C-alpha cells in the first residue's frame, strides 16, 4: 500500500550509485507524517561491503526494489494493527547506504561505494515537502535497529533543515527503536572499532552538539544513545529491549539451550541493569525485559506491555504530553522494566 518513488535528485544514491528512494502512502485528511528508517547492520571497508553486495544487495542498491511495500506495525493504516497513528501519512525509507544513516560521501574515482544515508534523509524530506509535507503539524522520524540509531543521528538535522527551508511550524520528533546500544565489554573477546573505521570510510556525520563535545576523531561516541541523546533538542521516544539480540551478538553472547552458568548470568543481569540505568533520565521510553530482535514495524507490535501499558498506548500518551511538564493520569510515557532476566515480563515476544 506504500508506493515507491525514486529520488528525483539522482545524485543522492544507494551504495552502488543507483538512486535512493522512499515508499509513500498519503493520507490527505492528516497532518501527521511518519518517516521510517529501515535497519540492517552496516559495512565498513571494501571487502566487507563487497560481501554485503553479493548477498544483501537490496541493502546496497535500488535496482531490484519492488514497486510497492505493505505497511505493517506502526506503518499500518488499519486501526486494529496500529492504534497509534493509523491515519498518518506513511513513509518507508529503505536503508541502502550501509552507514547507519550517517554518510555524506559520493561514489567517485576514489570511492567504490557511495555512503549517503544522511543526505538520503535530507533529500526525502525536501521532495516530500512538495507532496504535502509542507502542511504537516508533526513529522515523526522513526527507525529500527540501524535505523533507530539513524534517528538519533539525524532527527535534529531534519528539524534544522525544515527551519532553514522556512517551515518552523512542523514539529520534528524522533522514535528510536532497537538502536540504543552500549559500548560495553564483551562476554568473550573477538565492534566499536568498526564504527570508528566506518565513519572515516563513509565520511560519516554526527549531530553538531555531540560532535562539539567529543571533538575530532571521537565522533564514534555519538553513535551511542546514552551519549548522543542528552545533546538532542528534538523530543525523542526510545524503544529498547533490555536484552537486545544485536547487542548480545556484538557482546559474543549466544543463549542456546544448556543451563547458564554464573559468569554469563552475572553478565546478562549487569547488561540489563546498565541499559536500565542509561534510560533513567529518558522521560519517553519503552524498555521491556525481553531477549528479542523484534521491531516496531512488526504486525503484533501491540502485544508487549510494560507495567500494563502497550507501546501504542505509551506513544499516544507521548503525543498528549507534547500538546501545548505535568504527567498524565493513567497515561504513562516512561516505561522501563525493573525485573532482571529475559522474559521476566510475561508479554515478551515468543518468537
Ligand X SMILES: Cc1cc(C(=O)O)c(C)n1-c1cccc(Cl)c1
Ligand Y SMILES: *[C@@H]1O[C@H](CO)[C@@H](O)[C@H](O)[C@H]1NC(C)=O
Binding residues vs ligand Y (CB under 6 A): 9, 11-12, 119, 123
Contact partner, 11, from ligand X, ligand Y, none, Cβ < 5-8 Å per class: ligand Y
For ligand X, which is the closer residue by CB, 39 or 174?
39
Could you tell me which residues come within 8 angstroms of residue 120 by beta carbon, excluding any fewer than 6 positions away?
A: 7, 12, 20, 93, 96, 97, 101
Shortest gap between Cβ of 100 and ligand X (angstroms)? 5
Contact partner, 340, from ligand Y, ligand X, none, Cβ < 5-8 Å per class: none
Distance separating alpha carbons of residues 99 and 145, to the nearest angstrom: 12
Distance separating alpha carbons of residues 186 and 247, to the nearest angstrom: 10
Could you tell me which residues come within 8 angstroms of residue 214 by beta carbon, excluding any fewer than 6 positions away?
A: 221, 222, 227
* Residue of 156, 177, 244, 319 with catalytic role: 244
Task: Characterise 97 by phi-psi region: left (phi > 0), alpha (psi -120 to 50), beta (else).
Answer: alpha
In the residue annotation, 177 being an active-site residue is answered as no
CB 94 within 8 A of CB 20: yes
Pairing of strands 89-93, 171-177: unpaired
* Residue of 293, 303, 343, 347 with catalytic role: 293
Contact partner, 146, from ligand Y, ligand X, none, Cβ < 5-8 Å per class: ligand X
In the residue annotation, 97 being an active-site residue is answered as no
In the residue annotation, 293 being an active-site residue is answered as yes
For ligand Y, which is the closer residue by CB, 11 or 78?
11
Q: How far is CA 205 from CA 66, 146, 199, 220, in A?
A: 30, 15, 7, 10
Residue number closest to ligand Y, CB atom:
9
For ligand X, which is the closer residue by CB, 149 or 154?
149
By CB under 6 A, name the binding residues for ligand X. 39, 41, 100, 145-146, 149, 181-183, 191-192, 194-195, 223, 246, 250
Shortest gap between Cβ of 193 and ligand Y (angstroms)? 29
- Residues classed as catalytic: 145, 244, 293
Amino acid at each position: 500500500d506504500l508506493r515507491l518513488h525514486l529520488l528525483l535528485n539522482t545524485s543522492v544514491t544507494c551504495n552502488d550509485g543507483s538512486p535512493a528512494g522512499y515508499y509513500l502512502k498519503e493520507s490527505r485528511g492528516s497532518r501527521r507524517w511518519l518517516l521510517f528508517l529501515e535497519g540492517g547492520w552496516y559495512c565498513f571497508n571494501r571487502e566487507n561491503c563487497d560481501s554485503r553486495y553479493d548477498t544483501m544487495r537490496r541493502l546496497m542498491s535500488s535496482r531490484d526494489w519492488p514497486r510497492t511495500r505493505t505497511g505493517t506495525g506502526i506503518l499500518s493504516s488499519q486501526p486494529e494493527e496500529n492504534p497509534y497513528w493509523w491515519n498518518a501519512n506513511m513513509v518507508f525509507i529503505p536503508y541502502c547506504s550501509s552507514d547507519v544513516w550517517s554518510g555524506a560521501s559520493s561514489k567517485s574515482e576514489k570511492n567504490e561505494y557511495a555512503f549517503m544515508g544522511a543526505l538520503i534523509i535530507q533529500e526525502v524530506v525536501r521532495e516530500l515537502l512538495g507532496r504535502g509535507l509542507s502542511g504537516a503539524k508533526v513529522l515523526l522520524l522513526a527507525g529500527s535497529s540501524a535505523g533507530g540509531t539513524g534517528v538519533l543521528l539525524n532527527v535534529d538535522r531534519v528539524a534544522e533543515q525544515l527551519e532553514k527551508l522556512g517551515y518552523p511550524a512542523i514539529q520534528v520528533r524522533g522514535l528510536a527503536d532497537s538502536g540504543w546500544f552500549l559500548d560495553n565489554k564483551q562476554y568473550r573477546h573477538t565492534p566499536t572499532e568498526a564504527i570508528r573505521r566506518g565513519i572515516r570510510y563513509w565520511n560519516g556525520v554526527v549531530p553538531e552538539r555531540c560532535r562539539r563535545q567529543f571533538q575530532e576523531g571521537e565522533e564514534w561516541n555519538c553513535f551511542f544513545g546514552y551519549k548522543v541523546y542528552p545533546t538532542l533538542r528534538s523530543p525523542v521516544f526510545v524503544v529498547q529491549w533490555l536484552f537486545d539480540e544485536a547487542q548480545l551478538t556484538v557482546d559474543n553472547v549466544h543463549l542456546t539451550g544448556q543451563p547458564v552458568q554464573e559468569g554469563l548470568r552475572l553478565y546478562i543481569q549487569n547488561l540489563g541493569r546498565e541499559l536500565r540505568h542509561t534510560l533513567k533520565d529518558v522521560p519517553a521510553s519503552f524498555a521491556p525485559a525481553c531477549l528479542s530482535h523484534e521491531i516496531i514495524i512488526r504486525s503484533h507490535w501491540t502485544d508487549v506491555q510494560v507495567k500494563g501499558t502497550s507501546l501504542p498506548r505509551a506513544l499516544h500518551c507521548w503525543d498528549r504530553s507534547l500538546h501545548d511538564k505535568t504527567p498524565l493520569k493513567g497515561c504513562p510515557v516512561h516505561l522501563v522494566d525493573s525485573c532482571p532476566w529475559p522474559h521476566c515480563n510475561p508479554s515478551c515476544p515468543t518468537g
